[PDB]
Every structure is written in structure tokens, then in C-alpha cells.
Design a binder for this molecule. Structure first.
Ligand SMILES: [Mg+2]
Ligand SMILES: [Mg+2]
Ligand SMILES: [Mg+2]
Ligand SMILES: [Mg+2]
Lengths: 51, 159, 172, 58, 185, 222
RNA sequence: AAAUAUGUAAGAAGUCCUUGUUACUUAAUUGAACGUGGACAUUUGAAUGAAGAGCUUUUAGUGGGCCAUUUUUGGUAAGCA
RNA sequence: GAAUACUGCCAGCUGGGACUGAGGACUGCGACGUAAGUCAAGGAUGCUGGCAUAAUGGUUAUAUGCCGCCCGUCUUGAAAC
């Protein structure tokens, strides 16, 4: 009789998509990424800075 | 007064092409037409018998009748709010086979060949054609191709 | 629009069998966003070479930030623009702390003095002037003098209220 | 007292308001205008084909 | 605003009920409405729709037509269903024993079926003995043999009957109908 | 004991195992999206390190919003808007990108704003304004059983299966998209950002392709 | 020699394999047309949409038009034609 | 070697304001709970105060703010000088 919006009303959000509980529990919206230290090539940097 | 004769406004459409006048080459008369063939209409101005009316220039139809020197062609014509069926008796000089239909029949043969090969190995041969797809990812190397280009040019007269 | 960014846009012709690995043409484009940057790139490649967006490709777009945003520089700017009855080349000098800000000022100034819209202007070249005595415009040279200092006479203070009880002064 | 002579204004809109319809092809088109010799022979060909089919199926 | 692709508020164009006020027809309609709703047999839906039809849309079905239909292979024992009138036919001299369910039987048709040994049945008895239209055979009369249809589509070269009161010579058989008098059609 | 509790227990068991299937499918979708995103980022970084340029794959999905009213439209664009199911202003649809649809968009440029939607935009659009076309009726989704009843023949069992079929242009994209009723969006909450809408986005207007800024526009529109 | 506009096709009434009819056709057991029987799977042969699709009867009003962008004729031009 | 801006994401948290409360036994999908149950989960309930009549409200006259050209007709076009 009345459309209830998910993205609010977490009861309806959980009725759909049972994975929202795991998402919220593990904070998958705030996932820290693994660090990497690869460096751009000197040709790339020189091309970027070129006039 | 006005003038709406049979060949009015056909001055250029019934031209022979440039340096292409004279007699018709024999392959035109050696072509074979059967009932159901799809043909294009292009009037030859040097042949005044069996010529189509200017409306049917560039129209494509279906053969329904074969006579001694002519072919009956069915053309759907726009009259008012509906299409009417029109039957033309045209000599073979004004008719050529539709290359589109020839290539479609070739595609039918190739589709059968692919399906039969997939019947042995490689199931789901995916007969249907597809529209051009967006490009996939790619890597563009700079080795020997360093990006280097200049800016827009200043104005100058060249006069 | 006037919040300009500078992008390098690198593109090329679509590779074929006869000529794989085309030549990767690159431009520097002042634009408010990447969509406009890519469009301006294709407009200029369209005008200079026999290539268009359909038969081409954008391989890279990168924002170029100012090296020293807090260093006051003098910029020579060569532009080509369309007036109401012709096309003209101009040279102008802007004292500013970044290329995008200098180009912003240039567009405002062209709009103000020559009624030239962004539509009508080609930025031929923006280059920092490395030292004084090469600055050619007096409206920029006058700010390069030693121990420069000037007052700001007739200061007008904005009132937060409709009525004032004190007959304001303009000292400063 | 002259009036407008001619115009095709609104004519395409009128033609399309009940749409433009194709002529609804059938299987077995009418043999009108077909060569009389071919039609005359085709009658006997169909007669013989039906006779042979009846003699086979029974 | 909506860019409408089809006409709005368009009625379906099909009858949802009989146009008549026959109370017994309305009782038959409510019976077959219940059957068409509570059964998956398409026979009940077909009979229900036929119960709405007008008189020109339910032409009479002759007993000769019924006998010819019963001559079909494997249809000798089926129940013939005519949603309409079954008329008599004297062109036939033999009639099989069969069950015919119809809205109306003429006196001759009913007498011929009963004499042949069969029975004439109303649609409610048909519904009782075949709730799903089991072993039925729905027959329809010739719709386009109506006299009004001859004049439909009158025009040049259409080959239809002109709408005319008196026939014979002097009545539309002159200029326009023969080459010797102007033109032919 | 009129045989009520038995089938109620069986129905609850069926629901529980169905939800377990949905849960594992959604976990797989989440890991697939995370892997695709990180692989794209790392491919860009590796091309930079090697001195090359990583040209990302051309976008496969566009979201199109009709921004012009229904009066005074030439017949050809009017027909294309009808075929794209944009029959009123602020209506939106998903279109998979081919040459055949790029020509359609290029033919209706002045009346639409379209771009490349993100996963967040697609998910919020379907969750809040997603309606199914069932028996020619507009039905609020609001439940996975509706989706499994109307698209379960394609292996689409939940709203997240539907979203996956949209964001990744899958084999049954056409069926899933046509099942989705055209989204009816409100006017943008912070306005259009421009004084005049009916110029191209490049020229300071609102129509045409605004590739990644369609996300901001649609988010404010719903 | 464009742009725009415009015809046709993108299959089951289809394709392939054997062999049946004829008074037409062939030098001919050659063809033509229409067929019996057999094979082709679900991507049955591009995209998008399809609001139900087709079919018929009958009858109203109307048959003075005018405006705008663009193309365009007469005219110096016109809120002109 | 960091920081921050810009852009983007979170099925992160939370404060203030406005409009609405359609339906009327139960049935569904969920959630939290070992279960028993409970719940914001197929549309508002709980507690409290004043009045119980011209108080609310209706009608009517007037005032104020903004808006409102005379109908019918012929006409491309009518408030028409
Ligand atoms: Mg007239
Ligand atoms: Mg606001
Ligand atoms: Mg009149
Ligand atoms: Mg007023």
C-alpha cells in the first residue's frame, strides 16, 4: 500500500539485499587500500611538464 | 499552361553517362531473372521501349512475371496514406539484380556452414550480426612515439 | 569557465593495418573540465590535421598543476581572436601566480576591452617571462620597481545595516 | 477575390495520423498479369501433382 | 505533459456483455462467466464470447452443416455446439444420431434430430455434462453470405452489387457498365 | 492440523535457502566490482611506470534523461525519444552503447542530458525509483520475489542481480532494461547549475554528453 | 560532385538434400513453377520500441486559412503576393 | 617524507524545520532474539489541556492584496473605431 525507500528504513534495506548486514559489519564502504610505490616513467613526467 | 507529360523532368535522369553512350553490352541480355528475384530499376535512355516511368527510377522491386524480352516487377508506391501495389512491364536493359540480395544469400550460406561446423565442435556459434561495439582497453607505448605537438597557429593573410 | 584548469590531452588517429602506432599528438588546453578539454582538443586537431573525433582516439588526459603556485610571475600571452570584421593576433602581459589564473584574467580582459567571447579566442602561447627588461608592457613594468608601495585612498566600508548614526569616513 | 492555390501543408500529418500501411503480402499471390502460357501449363501441372498425391496417400 | 504514443482512454472495442435484455441469456452468460473464470478450458472462454454476439454475427447453422461436420474423421461421436440457432434443411435425406447443443432449435431442426435419434440440448445442460468442453465441436454459420455484404466495397472494378431497388433492363446497365455505352466500369 | 503449519514451515525453508543464495551472489558481485576497480587503477599505474598510456575501455552503458518538454519537437527526434521510452520531461533510461544507439543519441542531443552512470548512481536509482513492467503495469519492485517471478528465467533473482545486469552489460541486458519501467525523476534539487539549459553541456548549457557529470545531475534529480 | 532527404534487404511463406506433376521449355532424363519425404534449436539469422495486433461497416464536421525558423519565386519594397 | 585542496564513494553517525497519516480482524517479506516472543517489517499511534459554543465552521455584506476588457456571432484574426 505504500512504497518504502531503501537507502533509508534499514528494515526494508535488509529485506532486500541480505548482504547489507555484512557490508555494514565489515565497513566495506571504508576499505583501506594496499599501498604501492610504483613510480611514473621519466618520459611520462617530461611529457606532462613539456611546454 | 503547365506540362505533366510522361517524361517531364527527366532531362538528366535519362542521360547516358559520360562517354558511355552507344549500344548496350551483352551481359545485360545474358543475365537471367526468375520470379522472386529482387531487382533495381535504372532506365537506359537509349532503349525507349519498355522504359519505366520516372517515379520508378531507383526503386527496387520483386519479379513476378517473365516474358520474352521483359520482366514484370512489383513496386510498392506511396499513394495518399497507404502503399499500393504497382506492376511494371520492363525490358531487361532497365533492370539489374540487387547486390544486397546476392550478399544476403551468401550470408545465408555462411550461416548454414557455421551452424553445421558448430554442430560438430564449438557449440553456440552465435549466428546474429552485432553493431559496432565500444573499444576494449589498450596500452599505447611511447617507445619511438614520444607525444610532441604544438599549439593553434597565429592568423596570417596569405594574400 | 573562469575557474580554469590546464589539461594535457594526448590523442592519435585510430590504428589501422597499414599504419599501426600513430604519432600521438599532444596539446595543452585551458578548460573548466575534462569534457570541454577533450572537445577543444578535437576542435584544434580538426583544424590543424586531417583527423576528426570519429576517426581518432584520446589516449590520455591529465591535469597539469602549477609548479610554484605561490610565486608571482609575469606571463607573456600570444592570442589569436576574431573581431566583428576580421581576425587579429595580440600579445599581452599578465602578472599573476599561475597559468590558469593568468588565462582567466586574459579571457576577462579580452571580453572587457574587445567584446571577444571564449568562442572567438585561440590561445596561441602562454610563457613565463624569465627576467625583467624583457617585460614590454608598461602596465606590467610599473609594478616591478624597487620597494614598490602605494596607498589605497578613499576606502569605502560596507555597512551591514540600512541606517548609520556616524557619518562614515574614508580614511585608510 | 483570389484564394490560396495549393499547398501540401498538413498532408503528411494527416497521412501519418492513421499511419502509412504496407500492402499485406500473401502466400500464393494472384496470377493476374502472369504469362497465359505459363498459367495454362501450371494448371495441368497442379492437376497432375494432386492426382499423384491422391494416388499415393489414398 | 506526456508525449502520448497511443490514443488515451480507448475502449477495448469488444462486447463485454450481451446487448439484449433476455434474462435467460443473461443467466447463461453468468454461468459461462463463472466457468471461464474458474476453469482453464478455452472452450468456456470461446462460448462466453460467442454469447455476446449480435444476430448478424451469429448466423444460423443448418443441420446439413452439422451432418457435414460430423462426417469429419473422428468427429462422429462429438457434441456439436452452436451458439445460436440451428435451422432445418430438406436438401439432406439422411441424418446421423448425435447430440447438438444450441441456443435455439427451429421446429424442423429439432424434429429432424430427434427423429434421427439424437437429442437437442441447451447450453446449461452442455455445461453440466461437459464443464471443460470435452469432446465438443463448435460450429459457426456463414457470416459473409448475408445480403448486406454484397454491397460492401462498391466501386470501380471491385465487382460488388450496387445498392438498387428495381432490377432489370433500364436499371443501371448502361453507360458505365459496357463499352458500347461510354465505358465499362 | 488441517495442513497449514507443514507448508508454512516448508515455505520458510524455501525462503531461507533462497536468501542464502542471494547473499552469496551479492558477496560475489561485491568482490567482482572491487577487483575490476583495483585492476583498472593498477593498470593505469603500471602503464605510467612502463612509460605507456593505459587507454581505459570505452564506456558500455549510458543513462539518458529527457530534459525538454513535449511541445514543438521535430518528428524524427520525437520518434527516437519514443523508442527510447522518454515520453515526458525528466524521464530516464539506460542504454547500452553501440553504433546503432550512439546515432540515436546524436540525433536527440538537444533534448536529453546523458552520460556514464556509476554503480552508486545505478544502485540508488533502482532502489528508490525502480519499477517493473508486469502485465503492462508499473509495479514497485520493493521485493525480490517480484524480480524472480518476472526475470528468474534469465538467472536474475534479486534487485542486486538486476543492478549487476545493468552496470555490467550482460547477455540479458535488453530484457532486464525493458523490464525496468522508465525512471521518473524530479527536477534537480540544487538546480541545473546553468542559467540556460538548452545549450550543449560543452557550451555552458545542459544537453548532450556530460560523461561523468551525469552522476551528479541524476543524484540531485532523484 | 556533397550534406540532408529517398528505394530495397537483414529468412520458417527460410535454406539445403533426394525425387514427383505438366499440355510450358530444352538437343536432351534441360529447365521453370508447384510439390511428397528428410535435415536445420531456441542468438529463426542486426538495434530499439511495440502503448494489444489485424479487419470491416457506417456516418459528422471540413473543403476561406494564417504565423515562425530554414529553402525559395515575383516585386525597390511591404504587417505584399 | 608528509599534509591539505579538488573530485568521488560509504548497505557511516547524528541535530533542526515543513507537508502528509491514505487503509481498517489475520494472511506477506523481513529484522532482533537459543527458543518465548518482540519490532521503525503489506499506510498513526500514545499521553495531555481548553472549550462544548457561534468558539471552529458555513452563508452573506464590506475592507485589504493580487488578478479580471462585453456577451452572442461571422472571421486567419474581436474588448474592438
Ligand atoms: Mg481553396
Ligand atoms: Mg533551493
Ligand atoms: Mg466556406
Ligand atoms: Mg488588472
Amino acid at each position: 500500500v505504500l512504497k518504502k525507500n531503501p537507502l533509508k528504513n534499514k528494515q526494508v534495506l535488509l529485506r532486500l539485499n541480505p548482504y547489507a548486514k555484512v557490508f555494514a559489519a565489515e565497513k566495506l564502504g571504508s576499505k583501506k587500500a594496499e599501498k604501492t610505490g610504483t613510480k611514473p616513467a621519466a618520459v611520462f613526467t617530461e611529457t606532462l611538464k613539456h611546454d | 499552361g503547365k506540362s505533366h507529360g510522361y517524361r517531364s523532368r527527366t532531362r538528366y535522369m535519362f542521360q547516358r553517362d559520360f562517354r558511355k553512350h552507344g549500344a548496350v553490352h551483352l551481359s545485360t541480355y545474358l543475365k537471367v531473372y526468375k520470379v522472386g528475384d529482387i531487382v533495381d530499376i535504372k532506365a537506359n535512355g537509349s532503349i525507349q521501349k519498355g522504359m519505366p516511368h520516372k517515379f520508378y527510377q531507383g526503386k527496387t522491386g520483386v519479379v513476378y512475371n517473365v516474358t520474352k524480352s521483359s520482366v514484370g516487377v512489383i513496386i510498392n508506391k506511396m499513394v495518399g496514406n497507404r502503399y499500393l501495389e504497382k506492376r511494371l512491364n520492363l525490358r531487361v536493359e532497365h533492370i539489374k539484380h540487387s547486390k544486397c540480395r546476392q550478399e544476403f544469400l551468401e550470408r545465408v550460406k555462411a550461416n548454414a556452414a557455421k551452424r553445421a561446423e558448430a554442430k560438430a565442435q564449438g557449440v553456440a556459434v552465435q549466428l546474429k550480426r552485432q553493431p559496432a561495439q565500444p573499444r576494449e582497453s589498450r596500452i599505447v607505448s611511447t617507445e619511438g612515439n614520444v607525444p610532441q605537438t604544438l599549439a593553434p597557429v597565429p592568423y596570417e593573410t596569405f594574400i | 569557465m573562469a575557474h580554469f584548469k590546464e589539461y594535457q590531452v594526448i590523442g592519435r588517429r585510430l590504428p589501422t593495418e597499414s599504419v599501426p602506432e600513430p604519432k600521438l599528438f599532444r596539446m595543452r588546453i585551458f578548460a573548466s573540465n575534462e569534457v570541454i578539454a577533450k572537445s577543444r582538443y578535437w576542435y584544434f586537431l580538426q583544424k590543424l590535421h586531417k583527423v576528426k573525433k570519429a576517426s581518432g582516439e584520446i589516449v590520455s588526459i591529465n591535469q597539469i598543476n602549477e609548479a610554484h603556485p605561490t610565486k608571482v610571475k609575469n606571463f607573456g600571452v600570444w592570442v589569436r581572436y576574431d573581431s566583428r570584421s576580421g581576425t587579429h593576433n595580440m600579445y599581452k602581459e599578465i602578472r599573476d601566480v599561475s597559468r590558469v589564473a593568468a588565462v582567466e584574467t586574459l579571457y576577462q580582459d579580452m571580453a572587457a576591452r574587445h567584446r571577444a567571447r571564449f568562442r572567438s579566442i585561440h590561445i596561441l602561447k602562454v610563457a613565463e617571462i624569465e627576467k625583467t627588461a624583457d617585460v614590454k608592457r608598461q602596465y606590467v613594468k610599473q609594478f616591478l620597481t624597487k620597494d614598490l608601495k602605494f596607498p589605497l585612498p578613499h576606502r569605502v566600508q560596507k555597512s551591514t545595516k540600512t541606517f548609520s548614526y556616524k557619518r562614515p569616513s574614508t580614511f585608510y | 477575390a483570389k484564394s490560396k492555390n495549393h499547398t501540401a501543408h498538413n498532408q503528411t500529418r494527416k497521412a501519418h495520423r492513421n499511419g502509412i500501411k504496407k500492402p499485406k503480402t500473401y502466400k500464393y499471390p494472384s496470377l493476374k498479369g502472369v504469362d497465359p502460357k505459363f498459367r495454362r501449363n501450371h494448371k495441368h501441372a497442379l492437376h497432375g501433382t494432386a492426382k499423384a498425391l491422391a494416388a499415393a496417400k489414398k | 505533459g506526456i508525449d502520448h504514443t497511443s490514443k488515451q482512454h480507448k475502449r477495448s472495442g469488444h462486447r463485454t456483455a450481451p446487448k439484449s435484455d433476455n434474462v435467460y441469456l443473461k443467466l447463461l452468460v453468468k454461468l459461462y462467466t463463472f466457468l471461464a473464470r474458474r476453469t482453464d478450458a478455452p472452450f468456456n472462454k470461446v462460448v462466453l464470447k460467442a454469447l455476446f454476439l449480435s444476430k448478424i454475427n451469429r448466423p444460423p447453422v443448418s443441420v446439413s452443416r452439422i451432418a457435414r461436420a460430423l462426417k469429419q474423421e473422428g468427429a462422429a461421436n462429438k457434441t456439436v455446439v452452436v451458439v445460436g440457432t440451428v435451422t432445418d434443411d430438406a436438401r439432406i435425406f439422411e441424418f446421423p444420431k448425435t447430440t447438438v447443443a444450441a441456443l435455439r432449435f427451429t421446429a424442423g431442426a429439432r424434429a429432424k434430430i430427434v427423429k434421427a435419434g439424437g437429442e437437442c440440448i441447451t447450453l446449461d445442460q452442455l455445461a453440466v455434462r461437459a464443464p471443460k468442453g470435452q469432446n465438443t465441436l463448435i460450429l459457426r454459420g456463414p457470416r459473409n453470405s448475408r445480403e448486406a455484404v454484397r454491397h460492401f466495397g462498391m466501386g470501380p472494378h471491385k465487382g460488388k452489387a450496387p445498392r438498387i431497388l428495381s432490377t432489370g433492363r433500364k436499371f443501371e446497365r448502361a453507360r458505365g457498365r459496357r463499352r458500347s455505352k461510354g465505358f465499362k466500369v | 492440523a488441517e495442513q497449514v503449519a507443514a507448508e508454512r514451515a516448508a515455505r520458510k525453508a524455501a525462503n531461507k535457502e533462497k536468501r542464502a543464495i542471494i547473499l552469496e551472489r551479492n558477496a560475489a558481485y561485491q568482490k567482482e566490482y572491487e577487483t575490476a576497480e583495483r585492476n583498472i587503477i593498477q593498470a593505469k599505474r603500471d602503464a605510467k611506470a612502463a612509460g605507456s598510456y593505459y587507454v581505459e575501455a570505452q564506456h558500455k552503458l549510458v543513462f539518458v534523461v529527457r530534459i525538454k518538454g513535449i511541445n514543438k519537437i521535430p518528428p524524427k527526434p520525437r520518434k527516437v525519444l519514443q523508442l527510447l521510452r522518454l515520453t515526458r520531461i525528466n524521464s530516464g533510461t539506460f542504454v547500452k552503447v553501440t553504433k546503432a544507439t550512439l546515432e540515436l543519441l546524436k540525433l536527440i542531443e538537444p533534448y536529453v542530458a546523458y552520460g556514464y552512470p556509476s554503480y552508486s548512481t545505478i544502485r540508488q536509482l533502482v532502489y528508490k525509483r525502480g519499477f517493473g513492467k508486469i502485465n503492462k503495469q508499473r509495479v514497485p519492485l520493493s521485493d525480490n520475489a517480484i524480480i524472480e517471478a518476472n526475470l528468474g528465467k534469465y538467472g536474475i533473482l534479486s534487485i542486486d542481480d538486476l543492478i549487476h545486469e545493468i552496470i555490467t552489460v550482460g547477455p540479458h541486458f535488453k530484457q532486464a532494461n525493458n523490464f525496468l519501467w522508465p525512471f521518473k525523476l524530479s527536477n534537480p534539487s540544487g538546480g541545473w547549475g546553468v542559467p540556460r539549459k538548452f545549450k550543449h553541456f560543452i557550451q555552458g548549457g545542459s544537453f548532450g554528453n556530460r560523461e561523468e557529470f551525469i552522476n551528479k545531475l541524476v543524484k540531485s534529480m532523484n
